Enzyme design. Sequence first.
Site, PDB file in Angstrom:
ATOM      1  N   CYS A  13     -13.530  38.955   7.300  1.00  0.00           N
ATOM      2  CA  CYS A  13     -14.320  40.165   7.120  1.00  0.00           C
ATOM      3  C   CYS A  13     -13.576  41.360   7.669  1.00  0.00           C
ATOM      4  O   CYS A  13     -12.616  41.231   8.426  1.00  0.00           O
ATOM      5  CB  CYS A  13     -15.619  40.054   7.896  1.00  0.00           C
ATOM      6  N   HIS A  42     -12.768  32.109  16.130  1.00  0.00           N
ATOM      7  CA  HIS A  42     -12.787  30.636  16.085  1.00  0.00           C
ATOM      8  C   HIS A  42     -11.988  30.232  14.868  1.00  0.00           C
ATOM      9  O   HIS A  42     -12.539  30.063  13.780  1.00  0.00           O
ATOM     10  CB  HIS A  42     -14.204  30.041  15.930  1.00  0.00           C
ATOM     11  N   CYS A  96     -16.201  45.565  16.317  1.00  0.00           N
ATOM     12  CA  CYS A  96     -16.448  45.964  14.933  1.00  0.00           C
ATOM     13  C   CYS A  96     -17.233  47.226  14.772  1.00  0.00           C
ATOM     14  O   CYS A  96     -18.210  47.392  15.473  1.00  0.00           O
ATOM     15  CB  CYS A  96     -17.110  44.834  14.136  1.00  0.00           C
ATOM     16  N   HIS A 124     -26.007  35.280  22.185  1.00  0.00           N
ATOM     17  CA  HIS A 124     -24.802  35.647  21.464  1.00  0.00           C
ATOM     18  C   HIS A 124     -24.110  36.848  22.127  1.00  0.00           C
ATOM     19  O   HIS A 124     -24.763  37.808  22.496  1.00  0.00           O
ATOM     20  CB  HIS A 124     -25.096  35.894  19.964  1.00  0.00           C
ATOM     21  N   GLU A 126     -22.559  39.347  20.957  1.00  0.00           N
ATOM     22  CA  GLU A 126     -22.891  40.628  20.307  1.00  0.00           C
ATOM     23  C   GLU A 126     -24.229  41.200  20.824  1.00  0.00           C
ATOM     24  O   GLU A 126     -24.351  42.384  21.200  1.00  0.00           O
ATOM     25  CB  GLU A 126     -22.948  40.527  18.796  1.00  0.00           C
ATOM     26  N   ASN A 223     -19.847  28.477   4.393  1.00  0.00           N
ATOM     27  CA  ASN A 223     -19.730  29.707   3.608  1.00  0.00           C
ATOM     28  C   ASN A 223     -18.733  29.624   2.455  1.00  0.00           C
ATOM     29  O   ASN A 223     -18.901  30.309   1.446  1.00  0.00           O
ATOM     30  CB  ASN A 223     -19.470  30.941   4.502  1.00  0.00           C
ATOM     31  N   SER A 265     -13.163  32.158   7.193  1.00  0.00           N
ATOM     32  CA  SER A 265     -12.296  31.679   8.274  1.00  0.00           C
ATOM     33  C   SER A 265     -10.841  31.559   7.852  1.00  0.00           C
ATOM     34  O   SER A 265      -9.995  31.137   8.643  1.00  0.00           O
ATOM     35  CB  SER A 265     -12.777  30.317   8.792  1.00  0.00           C
TER      36      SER A 265
HETATM   37  S1  F3S Z   1     -16.648  41.566  12.422  1.00  0.00           S
HETATM   38 FE1  F3S Z   1     -17.381  41.126  10.455  1.00  0.00          FE
HETATM   39  S2  F3S Z   1     -18.924  39.834   9.718  1.00  0.00           S
HETATM   40 FE2  F3S Z   1     -19.559  42.024   9.822  1.00  0.00          FE
HETATM   41  S3  F3S Z   1     -20.067  42.908  11.852  1.00  0.00           S
HETATM   42 FE3  F3S Z   1     -17.904  43.210  11.548  1.00  0.00          FE
HETATM   43  S4  F3S Z   1     -17.527  42.951   9.331  1.00  0.00           S
END
Ligand code: F3S
Lengths: 281, 282
Positions: A13, A42, A96, A124, A126, A223, A265
């Site tokens: 992502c 991970h 992020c 978590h 976050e 996924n 991943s």
């Molecule tokens: S690390 Fe990724 S899965 Fe979404 S919150 Fe940011 S783009």
Amino acid sequence: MVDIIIAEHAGFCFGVKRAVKLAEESLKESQGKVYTLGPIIHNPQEVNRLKNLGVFPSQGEEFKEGDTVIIRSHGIPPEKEEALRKKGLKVIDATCPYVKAVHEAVCQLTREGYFVVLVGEKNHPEVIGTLGYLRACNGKGIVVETLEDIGEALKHERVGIVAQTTQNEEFFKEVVGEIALWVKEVKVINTICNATSLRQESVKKLAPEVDVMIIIGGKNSGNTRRLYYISKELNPNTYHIETAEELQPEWFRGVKRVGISAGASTPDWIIEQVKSRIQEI
Amino acid sequence: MVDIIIAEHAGFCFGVKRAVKLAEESLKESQGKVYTLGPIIHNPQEVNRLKNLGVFPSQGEEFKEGDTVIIRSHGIPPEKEEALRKKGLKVIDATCPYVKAVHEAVCQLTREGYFVVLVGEKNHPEVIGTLGYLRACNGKGIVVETLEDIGEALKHERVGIVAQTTQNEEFFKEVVGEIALWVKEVKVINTICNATSLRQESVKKLAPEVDVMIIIGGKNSGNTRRLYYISKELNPNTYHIETAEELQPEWFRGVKRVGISAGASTPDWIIEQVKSRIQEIC
Ligand code: F3S
Ligand code: F3S
């Protein structure tokens, strides 16, 4: 006309791609040792790839003054980030931007006078980070992980609702609608990130426009399996592989186009090893 | 006789009770003829009772300068209220305070920069009135009656959501959750009135605690019929009736406690008619 195409949003992502980039760029002109605050994701192979370049996953509090520490995509409480700066570390904030948006949203809601509900997993990192932000701006609120958690919020006339970036939509819709029935005023700032949608919509767009679809990822990767199935219903001619080793020569007889995507991943170099294994066939 | 308990919240809600009382009281200040703007409630016997007092259900535009007109509990667009005033009528505003709160809410949401979604029945007079308030405060919005209606709201980044006072909670919950998934920022002001819930829960509590349940209301009253079913589920000896005339002496053999409730369109004088006929049976 003729194309062998990697689907946009294939693999990591946005946030993780950016964290990896920030880590790699930190090595240039680093005067000390470079650490990520724990492993950057991970995926042991990718963590290993970065270690080999000189980006070390920290174990504890072993970094010293002048070292570089990279905050992971999930972020950390502001007082911890500050503690790291106070130790004389060069801090690279790879939180992020979607996570930062949650930080901002819980502070916005506090300023507007809402008791805050954060829909997500209590333990978590976050969520722990976001609670730190809520605290720093003198906000009050709770984490809602199951419907049973909403009781405290129901004591308030004005509830502001945000989501962990990876929060499941079904439960989020349920919490939001349920709280709305019980309290006077609800404000929702939908902070769910668009990563999975972006990856999946891109596969739906490519699959009917190619002859064969390669979906890369772990066999038991949930996924990647979803990606495979989305691709599959549009293009019965779809293969799910783990590495370039599986790409069988026979699959590409008479094909003019090849589409590729990959689960969350899968790093780009694996996607690239697949691309080059196919350009050979 | 025996023990008769009238369930809490049987009959008219707060707003309709208030409208009826305002209508009756206006006779004492009205030099001209007194009208309600349309029949005050959908109950022919109640409209007749008020007609006999001198409170007439308007049929068209027959009222004249100096006459009194009573706005019903559902309200009307502000420009129509003003039109009535300009015709030289004494205008009594009996809009329910909770309906007025919807009017307030759509304007508040407009001031705050939201595109408004009103969850409700498009052609319902309450909804038409509220759209008139939204228009008056230079607001923009739609009515969502079914889930397919939400499309236009999804074009906006900030959506404010309100409800017709009688909107069912299940659909409101669905609309709110769904819009929240698609737009950046949603604000909900829950304007659903609890009058129907209270009436139903009071029947829920009374039903098993008595020998026979009596549910009063017109057959075409949807929420009276729900009061019947809810009760019939918890006590087989639930009977739905429109008039005390229907009370069969048979039902009250060997009874100790009788429960009575009524739908939203049943005035208290009908409930008393039923109560004292039950006392006449026992
Ligand atoms: S690390 Fe990724 S899965 Fe979404 S919150 Fe940011 S783009
Ligand atoms: S008329 Fe009634 S049912 Fe509620 S919104 Fe007003 S009390």
